[PDB]
């Protein structure tokens, strides 16, 4: 018997019996066997096996058996087709690459997004801005002191607050130190309170954000407690430890983890490393080629080993041409170094065009990834919540 | 009985009785009840309940009951599916986020776009260019005087019309004052005519565009009536009130409200504030980081507290590096300040690349919003009009 | 009777009789009338009216009657739906704006793209490169002489070919005149041959490309025949007529009309004038606003009418700020004028960001139009030809 | 008889007999013939011819016969429709151009991507990094020596390694020669081993990458063996042969052929030559026009043949204006030459805007091509492998 009619939700699909056996182990293959009447309930009169699934995609599911290739329809959402083919016992790895990228589009993004009686209350005072009426004030104070520290760090590098008076040297003002002292007092209090009243201290140390808070207060204490005699080494060590203050601006990442857009940016960066590598490689190759070409172009009609050749051109060598190539490919154009010869002008035009092309090739991939993640997150926060409202298991 | 066949427009959908009860309160749930024969007319012979709706989307509507997840088909317009699921008594908030953004795509844009016997005629003389044979001429005259005022305001800042003669000072020409006098006469006449013959004076004051028209004529009268003795304070107050003349260029917005593209731009700006905030935050973080990094890079191999370190570099400090970072991230490249050291060159390349990336991330969202709004508005004005031509209520 | 079943290609659509009358005058409305049995052939047994059209779109065509709104399906090409609704006697102007832009997508582009026994042979010698074995050589010669003329015109402006000897003056070389003489001889021969052996001389004059060929040879003859005495006016008229030689570079458009990409560019420009107007308006408003703001920003903390205020800033006035604003909004950055004050720096950052935003808003529309036209043209030339191969009228 | 019902997978399509004959030679045309009962098996009772294909696309396949135009549905993958219409014996060249570009979208990209007992082992030691435990080390050594050679070549052009001592001249250091000697020894060993133990020596010579490896070592041997007497010609030939060392940086392409992104880039370049030609033509026309216009604009109100006119402007001539136009159209803005007159400023603004427009027109085509190729390749490498798992021929 070849007439095996299948009633999927009302539509009476029909095909030959031999076709269903092309994929042994699947539900249709089991159905096609003669000893399947009891396994699947069917009406003997109509002689049709009934199912309660989506009839639209069953056509493609069966066409897999017919032609031997699996495709996902473009008129339905990917997850729906995934659920249907999971019900029908078909692996999703067999989908052809013509329609795999869009099929595996929402799930990958979803997964990427998904990536002592006072201890609880004390730990909940910090680490969560919106969890009580007091955590918000603590977060605001932390933000205020972080911004004050960043501002003071930026001011310390100015010439108005570093007057020259150890013959003359340059001595920084004092109030810039008192402000940082107050900020450091607050930060050390917060750090002690967090570290003492926290579980799994090892995870706390590994958080990679407490290290920043520790190293941002260490230099102040080292400076205050290491300002004694023995200037020969003390002055040098203090001068080279004053560079560690750059870690004060990294505490701002301890505060932006709550902002949604920056989480989306982090996910996008973590999901598009290959594109960054490709961009770097393209830029390196182009920079090398165009530096060499401009170096040779700016010397046509010149004595090879003549000092005069490298006198009327900014490209004294190839290594310095990397800077010019990088500036030209990005359409930046500082103007510190430009060609002064017609062949150099042609090379510069080629460099600018090729730079635009190379830069514009991978960037759209990262942009599309970011757009996907951002739309998904904003839609996810648009919907407040929803109960199952389905009472499954009929 | 489990055989509950549904005839939706001709297609005979079939499913188990238990499935329809998974969503109590919905039309299908009421139908599945035994006491529903009289509620919904059906042929006892065929034993099928008839409906007169779209059969294509009923498959998805029922698959919601089957699998427990709601999706909108991608082969039909969103509004059609919305109407169908409103007929079937299903809330649109249950649609999964995999297909919610496109489903809520046209309606949000449509809503955003949708955002004394002489009093009527006198008020209609103004406030509406295309409403009579005389309003057009009034609008043209207003445009002419507005452009004249803007041109005179721009000229007043030039050195040819501000010769030096109160020892020398700089005295502006007189014709530039006579022109503005004529323009102010016209503007005050128009303002009086509008304010006198208008309803709900409070709304008139709150319009936020009449305030501009008032403040753009106030300084002229203050100047003409405040040019007496007591120079010690009169000269200073006049000099600092001469800055208020910048409000003369804002009257051009009173005239561009009719242009469609600028209304679309206003809607796009009002609908994409989060993207602007995200762009600002990204730029701020990048600027801070790259300013710090360039400041430190331009000093490798230097004495920490040595005046010579900040002698052969444009980056005397971090605050001035914000300007360089902003210029470099935008591919602008004025050239007023550029790195002069290899590490500085690497930092500059990184800054340019990261700036391109960050700028290109959110901007496409705003661009897509603007494109949607513009296409919708231009299509809306392409169609002149159309009667219902449906005679509903069959 | 309400059971009016419609058999469209096999699918048995069913609906109430009253529904079909909602749109009087249409084919379905006529069918629903009791006196329609003879008009449309149907089987009395099945009691179903047969049609031989596409069943898929009939669902939407009937849903128009059901719900009262017309939509075009997104799983089929627009022209197919247009043909179907033309067969069903429904106007295409009733489609809702949610799906009108894509429906009217291919046809508009197609229409835009669609926009004496020796007289025939002589006229066919020119005006068509690929029409014989001799027209190609004539076109190549014309191209050669056009390029020679352009090169000579560009050289005439150089300082090497204009030595100073009417005391000194500057006298151009002679060979640059002999070359142009040869080119002009060829061009006048071609122009005479074209004008003499052509129909509808008025259309020839109106072609707008023969005027260029005439004005590009007129100055040479005027110069050669107007080099006599009376220098007082002859020298001046010759000097101001030497400017007309710029029309020699416009003959290149007489030759690029065959290239497909430039025809596509012309169509895109002719189809996107509103976007250019919008871009111009946006740029003008931004330039004005930012020029005013930078002018005022560069003077904070200054004496209003003090010559010293306009001494340490490039923005002596607002009009010169238009140039800076235009350069900054485009990310060009010549560097001839930049802010030197922190408020000026903030204004410049805002200007650059707003310029990027404004420029990026309408340009994508033009880009999409160009892509559509280019893809359509390249696909049209990919297909060589095809006979009807349908033998219609069955 | 006109009732010819077709049972395609369960759906009972019906149409007139005359319709099927509109396309003679096709399977449906043969079926419609009276002598086709035995050719195609069918049930005499149901009077319906059975098929085992996809019912969804059969509607469009038959609509081709109905209306006379062929379209591909947008709810299925192109290859599926291609297979179906190949089964139904319909040529794919008849598809209208409204839906041809997307139909021929995956296949073109797929095709483009698809574009002495020791001889085998010895040849497999090279030419394949991942084929053994020793080839990887050889590839790493080759990479190390290639990078060393490139670094030495770049250093040779510096002034620190070319001190001045044939009166003074400039003599390069010696260690830079010893390093290159070691690298050349390795490279010549590798080249000999490859050329000796390879088949079809002609293909080896034609590989176009062995020529680079040969010419990159030839100059070293020529220099070492051509440093004798007869300086008059020896010095000149050595100086002009020292330029051939630029071929040392091209060996890096012998190593990047394995990287996937660069193969994708090569395919994209090979598939988008017309777009590059179009970009070049657009840039040339714009450059010419804007150079002429700026040359004329910077001279309004000047004596035609006066030396003073070309004294206060950077545009001494039109040829030098090509450089300015190229720099301005790309938003690069070096600043070496800028307009200094209001008409020049207007021309510059127009040039910048038109340059942005022209550059942005074709580039998106190349970007889309690259995105398609990259996504296809990355998806192809995501899937490790898969057996047929279909056992065809039922
Ligand atoms: C992927 C790659 C992409 C590449 C894209 C780009 C590809 C670019 C491709 C090619 C560009 C080629 C440009 C070559 C320019 C040479 C000019 C020169 O050196 O002149 C000097 C050579 O002479 C001297 O320096 C001193 C005299 C020695 C004898 C010279 C004899 C002639 C040699 C000829 C050797 C030619 C062959 C050289 C080797 C090829 C000076 O010559 P002169 O006669 O002494 O003085 C003339 C003065 N006059 C002009 C005022 C009358
Ligand atoms: C997110 C973050 C991303 C970051 C990305 C980027 C990451 C970048 C990471 C790292 C970059 C590290 C660069 C370090 C360069 C130091 C150079 C220097 O100071 O030399 C001076 C130090 O000496 C003096 O100034 C005076 C003498 C004092 C004693 C010095 C002993 C050596 C100290 C060594 C301390 C090393 C450790 C310093 C602390 C690390 C001069 O030395 P000299 O011997 O007096 O003179 C040499 C002269 N000669 C060269 C001509 C022979
Ligand atoms: C869409 C729109 C977007 C807009 C976005 C941007 C929005 C931006 C919004 C606001 C920005 C506001 C900036 C104001 C800066 C004023 C500075 C100034 O003029 O100082 C001079 C005024 O004095 C003189 O010039 C001479 C003395 C006359 C008496 C002055 C008394 C104080 C007046 C105050 C009037 C204030 C109010 C002015 C009117 C507002 C000098 O003062 P001095 O005391 O003589 O000398 C001080 C010297 N010292 C500093 C070294 C000690
Ligand atoms: C696709 C294309 C896109 C194009 C877009 C752009 C399109 C742009 C379109 C048009 C722009 C047109 C600009 C014209 C400017 C001319 C200025 C000039 O030359 O003045 C000089 C002419 O005179 C001399 O040089 C010496 C005296 C000779 C007699 C002059 C008589 C007047 C001639 C008039 C001939 C006019 C017609 C010229 C031919 C058209 C000096 O004149 P003057 O009187 O000696 O001195 C005045 C001094 N004063 C001002 C201080 C009082
Ligand atoms: C270093 C030097 N010093 C004195 C020189 N004198 C002189 O004439 N040249 C020279 C310069 N470039 C040349 O070719 C060019 C031109 C443009 C780009 C380009 C090339 C390459 C080599 C193919 C690589 O990319 C040639 Cl062939 C020569 C002979 C000189 N080079
Ligand atoms: C202010 C100053 N004054 C004199 C100095 N002398 C000297 O050598 N440095 C110096 C400079 N940059 C350093 O590191 C770099 C390099 C590039 C970027 C970058 C860094 C950080 C600090 C990790 C942050 O981002 C180091 Cl480690 C040092 C020792 C000096 N800094
Ligand atoms: C012409 C002049 N000459 C001497 C001055 N001295 C001085 O202090 N100002 C000044 C400058 N800009 C001011 O405001 C700013 C700042 C930035 C941008 C901006 C504004 C506006 C006016 C709101 C418009 O856009 C103010 Cl309020 C003042 C008082 C002076 N202006
Ligand atoms: C070479 C020269 N030398 C002395 C001159 N003195 C003078 O006045 N001109 C001049 C300059 N440009 C003119 O027109 C312009 C303006 C801007 C752009 C543009 C044009 C064209 C010609 C239509 C082409 O594109 C005119 Cl009409 C004239 C009379 C002079 N030109
Ligand atoms: K740029
Ligand atoms: K730039
Ligand atoms: K620039
Ligand atoms: K610059
Ligand atoms: Zn979905
Ligand atoms: Zn719609
Ligand atoms: Zn189509
Ligand atoms: Zn497919």
Q: Are A326 and A352 within one domain? A: yes
Atom number in ligand 8 closest to CA D343: 17
Experimental method: cryo-EM
- What tokens were used for C89? 């006697």
- DSSP letters, C150-174, are HHHHHHHTSSSSS-----S-----S
Partners of residue D57 in chain B, C-beta under 8 Å = none
Residue ranges in A242-310 assigned as alpha helix (H): 253-256, 260-271, 273-297
Q: Are C167 and C67 within one domain? A: no
CA gap C9, D15 in Å, rounded: 6
In which element (H, E) is residue C79 found?
helix C78-87
Work out the end-to-end distance of chain C between its first and last CA atoms, rounded to an integer number of angstroms: 34
DSSP character for C95? B
Task: Find the residues whose C-beta lies inside 6 A of ligand 4.
Answer: C 236, 240; D 300-301, 303
Q: Are A13 and A64 within one domain? A: yes
Give D247→chain A minimum CA distance, Å. 10
Give all strands (DSSP E) within chain A, no chain letters.
4-8, 11-15, 42-43, 48-51
Counting every residue written for chain D, the total comes to: 394
Q: Atom 16 of ligand 1 has which residue's CA nearest to it?
A: A301
Whether the CB-CB separation of B9 and B2 falls below 8 Å is answered with no
- What tokens were used for A100? 């795999």
Q: Are C251 and C274 within one domain? A: no
- Comparing CB atoms, the residue among A11, A285, A331 nearest residue D332 is A331
B212 CA to centre of ligand 3 in angstroms:
23
CA distances from D155 to A286, C203, D124, D233 (A): 18, 67, 35, 26
Task: Find the residues whose C-beta lies inside 6 A of ligand 5.
Answer: A 293, 296-297, 299-302, 304, 309, 343; D 240, 243, 246
Q: How many CA atoms lie within 13 A of A302 on its CB side?
A: 18
CA gap D51, A15 in Å, rounded: 8
- What tokens were used for D313? 């402007």
Residue ranges in chain B assigned as alpha helix (H): 17-20, 27-32, 55-67, 78-87, 100-103, 106-114, 119-125, 135-156, 175-196, 201-206, 210-215, 218-224, 231-241, 253-256, 260-271, 273-297, 321-329, 342-360, 363-382
CA gap B261, C83 in Å, rounded: 34
Helix (H, G, I), strand (E, B) or coil at D390: coil
Helix (H, G, I), strand (E, B) or coil at D48: strand
How many Å is the maximal CA-CA distance in chain C? Answer: 110
Cβ of residue C297 lying under 6 Å from some atom of ligand 7: yes
Whether the CB-CB separation of D286 and D278 falls below 8 Å is answered with no
Give all strands (DSSP E) within chain C, no chain letters.
4-8, 11-15, 42-43, 48-51
Q: How many CB atoms lie within 10 A of CB C233?
A: 8
**Closest to A373 measured CA to CA, from A223, A253, A244, A266:** A266
Last residue of a domain, one of C104, C133, C167: C104
Give C10→chain B minimum CA distance, Å. 11
C158 CA to centre of ligand 5 in angstroms:
27
CA gap C240, C41 in Å, rounded: 82
- What tokens were used for A13? 């699909």
- Comparing CB atoms, the residue among C54, C169, C336 nearest residue D335 is C336
Whether the CB-CB separation of A370 and B361 falls below 8 Å is answered with yes
In which element (H, E) is residue C144 found?
helix C135-156
CA gap D247, D236 in Å, rounded: 20
**Closest to C212 measured CA to CA, from C237, C185, C249:** C249
Q: Could you tell which of D231, D236, D239 is best to mutate to test the pocket of ligand 1, judged by most ligand atoms within 8 Å of the CB?
A: D236
Give A3→chain D minimum CA distance, Å. 11
Whether the CB-CB separation of B62 and B13 falls below 8 Å is answered with yes
Residue B392 within a domain: no
**Closest to B199 measured CA to CA, from B119, B131, B138, B126:** B119
In which element (H, E) is residue B6 found?
strand B4-8
Q: Are A362 and A290 within one domain? A: yes
State CA D165 to chain mean position distance: 49
Cα-Cα-Cα-Cα dihedral sign, residues C283, C284, C289, C291: positive
Atom number in ligand 6 closest to CA B295: 1
Q: List, in sequence order, every residue forming a beta bridge with C6; answer none if it has no partner.
A: C13, C49
CA gap D141, D235 in Å, rounded: 34
- The residue range of the domain holding A39 is 4-104
- What tokens were used for A278? 């490709």
- DSSP letters, D286-330, are HHHHHHHHHHHHTTTTS-TT-TTGGGS-S-SSSTTHHHHHHHHHT
CA gap D371, B185 in Å, rounded: 62
CA C340, C341, C342: angle at the middle one, nearest 5?
135
Whether the CB-CB separation of D59 and C54 falls below 8 Å is answered with yes
Whether the CB-CB separation of B98 and A106 falls below 8 Å is answered with yes
- What tokens were used for A353? 């065009």
b/e burial code for range C35-48 (CB count within 10 A of at least 16 → b):
eeeeeeebeeeeeb
**Closest to A352 measured CA to CA, from D86, D355, B319, B284:** D355
Helix (H, G, I), strand (E, B) or coil at C252: helix
**Closest to A219 measured CA to CA, from A202, A199, A243:** A243
Q: How many CB atoms lie within 10 A of CB A380?
A: 13
Residue C227 within a domain: yes
Whether the CB-CB separation of C210 and C216 falls below 8 Å is answered with no
b/e burial code for range B269-282 (CB count within 10 A of at least 16 → b):
eebbeebeebbebb
The reply, when asked if residue A37 is annotated as ligand binding, is no
Last residue of a domain, one of A74, A104, A134: A104
Cα nearest neighbour of A344 on chain D = D323
CA gap C342, C327 in Å, rounded: 19
Q: List, in sequence order, every residue forming a beta bridge with B13; answer none if it has no partner.
A: B6
The reply, when asked if residue A81 is annotated as ligand binding, is no
In which element (H, E) is residue A147 found?
helix A135-156
Q: Which residues contact D244 (CB under 8 A, 6 or more apart)?
A: D215, D218, D219
- Angle between helices C321-329 and C342-360 in degrees, nearest 10: 60
Q: Atom 1 of ligand 2 has which residue's CA nearest to it?
A: B293
Helix (H, G, I), strand (E, B) or coil at D361: coil
Atom number in ligand 4 closest to CA C236: 28
Q: How many CB atoms lie within 10 A of CB B115?
A: 8
Across the interface, whether the CB atoms of C74 and D71 are under 8 A apart is answered no
Radius of gyration of chain C, Cα coordinates, nearest whole angstrom: 34
Tell me phi and psi for residue D11, to 5 degrees: -75, 135
Across the interface, whether the CB atoms of B78 and C98 are under 8 A apart is answered yes
Whether the CB-CB separation of B224 and B218 falls below 8 Å is answered with no
A70 CA to centre of ligand 16 in angstroms:
8
Q: How many CB atoms lie within 10 A of CB A372?
A: 21
CA gap C219, C238 in Å, rounded: 9
Tell me phi and psi for residue D48, to 5 degrees: -130, 130
b/e burial code for range A353-362 (CB count within 10 A of at least 16 → b):
bbbbbbbbbb
State CA B44 to chain mean position distance: 58
Helix (H, G, I), strand (E, B) or coil at A95: strand
- What tokens were used for B192? 């009086």
CA gap C153, D291 in Å, rounded: 12
The CATH number covering residue A174 comes to 1.20.120.350
- What tokens were used for D208? 């176009």
Q: What share of chain A is helix, strand, coil (3-state, %, to 5)?
A: 60, 5, 35
B301 CA to centre of ligand 2 in angstroms:
5
CA gap C66, C69 in Å, rounded: 8
Residue identified by tokens 């005979």 is B12
Chains that touch A (3 or more CB pairs under 8 A): B, C, D
Q: Are C62 and C43 within one domain? A: yes
CA gap A339, D159 in Å, rounded: 20
Q: Are B124 and B222 within one domain? A: yes
Residue D390 within a domain: no
Following CA atoms D7, D12, D15, D18 in sequence, which dihedral angle do they give, to the nearest 10 degrees? 10
- Angle between helices B321-329 and B273-297 in degrees, nearest 10: 120
DSSP character for A4? E
In which element (H, E) is residue D155 found?
helix D135-156
Q: Atom 24 of ligand 6 has which residue's CA nearest to it?
A: B293
Partners of residue D159 in chain A, C-beta under 8 Å = 310, 316-317
Residue identified by tokens 């770049």 is D154
Resolution in angstrom units? 2.9
In which element (H, E) is residue D6 found?
strand D4-8
Residue B143 within a domain: yes
Across the interface, whether the CB atoms of B71 and A79 are under 8 A apart is answered yes
Q: Are C313 and C195 within one domain? A: no
Whether the CB-CB separation of D6 and D50 falls below 8 Å is answered with no
Chains that touch D (3 or more CB pairs under 8 A): A, B, C
Cβ of residue C302 lying under 6 Å from some atom of ligand 7: yes
Q: Which residues contact A306 (CB under 8 A, 6 or more apart)?
A: none
Q: Are D210 and D333 within one domain? A: no
CA gap A256, D113 in Å, rounded: 43
The reply, when asked if residue B338 is annotated as ligand binding, is no
Q: Are A90 and A129 within one domain? A: no
Atom number in ligand 4 closest to CA D300: 15
Strand order in the sheet with D11-15: D11-15, D4-8, D48-51, D42-43
- Comparing CB atoms, the residue among C12, C100, C364 nearest residue B367 is C364
**Closest to D337 measured CA to CA, from D346, D328, D329:** D328
CA distances from C26 to B383, C23, C41, C61, D301 (A): 22, 6, 17, 11, 70
In which element (H, E) is residue A370 found?
helix A363-382
Residue D383 within a domain: no
The CATH number covering residue D55 comes to 3.30.710.10
Whether the CB-CB separation of B84 and B54 falls below 8 Å is answered with yes
Q: Could you tell which of D290, D301, D348, D350 is best to mutate to test the pocket of ligand 4, judged by most ligand atoms within 8 Å of the CB?
A: D301
CA gap C58, C5 in Å, rounded: 13
Residue A392 within a domain: no
Whether the CB-CB separation of A109 and A372 falls below 8 Å is answered with yes
DSSP character for A118? S
CA gap A127, A131 in Å, rounded: 9
Burial class of residue B187 (count of CB atoms within 10 Å of its CB; 0-12, 13-18, 19+): buried
Residue B126 within a domain: yes
Q: Are A156 and A220 within one domain? A: yes
A303 CA to centre of ligand 1 in angstroms:
9
**Which residues have a beta carbon within 5 Å of ligand 10, which is an ion?**
A 333; B 333; C 333; D 333
Tell me phi and psi for residue D39, to 5 degrees: -60, -45
Q: Which ligand is nearest to the CA of A290?
A: 5
Strand order in the sheet with C4-8: C11-15, C4-8, C48-51, C42-43
- What tokens were used for D225? 């063996």
Cα-Cα-Cα-Cα dihedral sign, residues B36, B39, B40, B46: positive
Pairing of strands C48-51, D4-8: unpaired
Q: List, in sequence order, every residue forming a beta bridge with D42; answer none if it has no partner.
A: D49
| Number of separate domains in chain C | 3
Work out the end-to-end distance of chain D between its first and last CA atoms, rounded to an integer number of angstroms: 34
A364 CA to centre of ligand 14 in angstroms:
29
Residue A164 within a domain: yes
Residue identified by tokens 């159905």 is A31
Q: Are D175 and D206 within one domain? A: yes
CA distances from C34 to C30, C31, C48 (A): 9, 8, 14
The CATH number covering residue C319 comes to 1.10.287.70
Pairing of strands D11-15, A48-51: unpaired
Q: How many CB atoms lie within 10 A of CB B171?
A: 13
- What tokens were used for C358? 């404004």
């Amino acid at each position: 018997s070849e007439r095996i009619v299948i009633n999927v939700g009302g539509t009476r699909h029909q095909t030959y019996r031999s076709t269903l056996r092309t994929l042994p182990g699947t539900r249709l293959a089991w159905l096609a066997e003669p000893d399947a009447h009891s396994h699947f309930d069917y009406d003997p009169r109509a002689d049709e096996f009934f199912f309660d699934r989506h009839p639209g995609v069953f056509a493609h599911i069966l066409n897999y058996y017919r032609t031997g290739k699996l495709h996902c329809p473009a008129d339905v959402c990917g997850p729906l087709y995934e659920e249907e083919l999971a019900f029908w016992g078909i692996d999703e790895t067999d989908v052809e690459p013509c329609c795999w990228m869009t099929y595996r589009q929402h799930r990958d993004a979803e997964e990427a997004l998904d990536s002592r009686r006072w201890q609880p209350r004390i730990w909940a005072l910090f680490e969560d801005p919106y969890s009580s009426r007091y955590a918000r004030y603590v977060a605001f104070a932390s933000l205020f002191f972080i911004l004050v520290s960043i501002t003071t760090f930026c001011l310390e590098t100015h010439e108005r607050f570093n007057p020259i008076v150890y013959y003359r040297e340059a001595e920084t003002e004092a109030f810039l130190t008192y402000i940082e002292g107050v900020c450091v007092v607050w930060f050390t209090f917060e750090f002690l309170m967090r570290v003492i009243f926290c579980p799994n201290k090892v995870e706390f140390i590994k958080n990679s954000l407490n290290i920043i808070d520790f190293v941002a207060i260490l230099p102040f204490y080292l400076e205050v407690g290491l300002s004694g005699l023995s200037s020969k080494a003390a002055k040098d060590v203090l001068g080279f430890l004053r560079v560690v203050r750059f870690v004060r601006i990294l505490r701002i990442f301890k505060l932006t983890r709550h902002f949604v857009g920056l989480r989306v940016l982090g996910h996008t960066l973590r999901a598009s490393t290959n594109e960054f590598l490709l961009l770097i490689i393209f830029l390196a190759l182009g920079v090398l080629i165009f530096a060499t070409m401009i170096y040779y172009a700016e010397r046509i009609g010149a004595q090879p080993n003549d000092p005069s050749a490298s006198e009327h051109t900014h490209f004294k060598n190839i290594p310095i041409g990397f800077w010019w190539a990088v500036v030209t490919m990005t359409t930046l154009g500082y103007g510190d170094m430009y060609p002064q010869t017609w062949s150099g002008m042609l090379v510069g035009a080629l460099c600018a065009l090729a730079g635009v092309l190379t830069i514009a090739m991978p960037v759209p991939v990262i942009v599309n990834n970011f757009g996907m993640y951002y739309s998904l997150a904003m839609a996810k926060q648009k919907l407040p919540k929803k109960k199952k409202k389905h009472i499954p298991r009929p």
